Design a protein around this ligand. Structure first.
Ligand code: ACO
Ligand code: CL
Ligand code: ZN
Length: 258
């Protein structure tokens, strides 16, 4: 009745949430998505026809990052409306809430793919409001379930902060963070603040992380104290811990200006 499973590429993925695909698309569905253009179809037959016809082998937009077989395509929703609407319907399957799927023009989408001989296979993405009333540098972030727990989510988070640094600005993800968002951000923020430390204003300037996110991270690392209510960094090179990363953003492979 609702879409509960999709076939994309040669993965099938069960839904985590309702996504408002048109009702008849509630086939089973089984919804069958082209992995390159993200067109949604109702039947294996229209799926197989499309696959032999569709000429796309990668996302639209500009490839603003490439290192080994990892790339990021920047995709303005005003210029690739249908693709971006298709993407937002896909993402809503794994996001407990999203803005209206058809209203993509206020956003730019950064699409992460793994590249092989066949083409560039979508791993995940984040979106960003062109203008955020709350200073959000990410609106939604997603690694598709089959690629999760491999470092792709932290890669995207890092990449969003690379864009913030280049724009000489601090940013934070849009609230509320899902429980998995919470774990990923806390993890990335701790690694970055720890690798840096080995001022809170200065940590902010250096990383584009907000002072509020720096403070809450430092508290959870026990590296902050109170002096007449004011938050003071309190640490030793002693630890600055690092016991129990996999893919990082190389600024040299990034081709983007503010
Ligand atoms: C602003 C917002 O968009 S909030 C919404 C965020 N997105 C979602 O909720 C969509 C569904 N979830 C996801 O797409 C992802 O889980 C993200 C994008 C939230 C995480 O993506 P991943 O590719 O799994 O991230 P990655 O492998 O980089 O791991 C990040 C951290 O989260 C932890 N984590 C990820 N999944 C789990 C899990 N199932 N159980 C426990 N910890 C987990 C990882 O172990 C890692 O912590 P570590 O650094 O201590 O190892
Ligand atoms: Cl699944
Ligand atoms: Zn296609």
């Amino acid at each position: 009745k609702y879409v509960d499973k999709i076939h994309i590429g040669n993965y099938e993925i069960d839904a985590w949430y309702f996504s408002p695909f048109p009702e008849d698309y509630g086939k089973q569905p089984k919804l069958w998505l082209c992995e390159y253009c993200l067109k949604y179809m109702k039947y294996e037959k229209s799926y197989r026809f499309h696959l032999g016809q569709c000429q796309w082998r990668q996302p639209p937009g500009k490839e603003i990052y490439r290192k080994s077989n990892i790339s990021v395509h920047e995709v303005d929703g005003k210029d690739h409306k249908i693709y971006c609407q298709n993407l937002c319907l896909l993402a809503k399957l794994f996001l407990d809430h999203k803005t209206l799927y058809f209203d993509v023009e206020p956003f730019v989408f950064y699409i992460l793919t793994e590249v092989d001989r066949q083409g560039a296979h979508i791993v995940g993405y984040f979106s960003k409001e062109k203008e955020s009333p709350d200073g959000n540098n990410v609106a939604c972030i997603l690694t598709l379930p089959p690629y999760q727990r491999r470092g792709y989510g932290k890669f995207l988070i890092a990449f969003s902060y690379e864009l913030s640094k280049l724009e000489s600005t601090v940013g934070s993800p849009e609230k509320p963070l899902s429980d998995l968002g919470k774990l990923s951000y806390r993890s990335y923020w701790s690694w970055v603040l720890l690798e840096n430390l080995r001022s809170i204003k200065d940590l902010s300037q250096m990383t584009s992380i907000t002072q509020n996110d720096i403070i809450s991270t430092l508290q959870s690392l026990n590296m902050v104290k109170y002096w007449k209510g004011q938050h003071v960094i309190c640490v030793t090179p002693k630890l600055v811990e690092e016991h129990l990363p996999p893919i990082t953003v190389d600024s040299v492979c990034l081709k983007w200006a503010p």
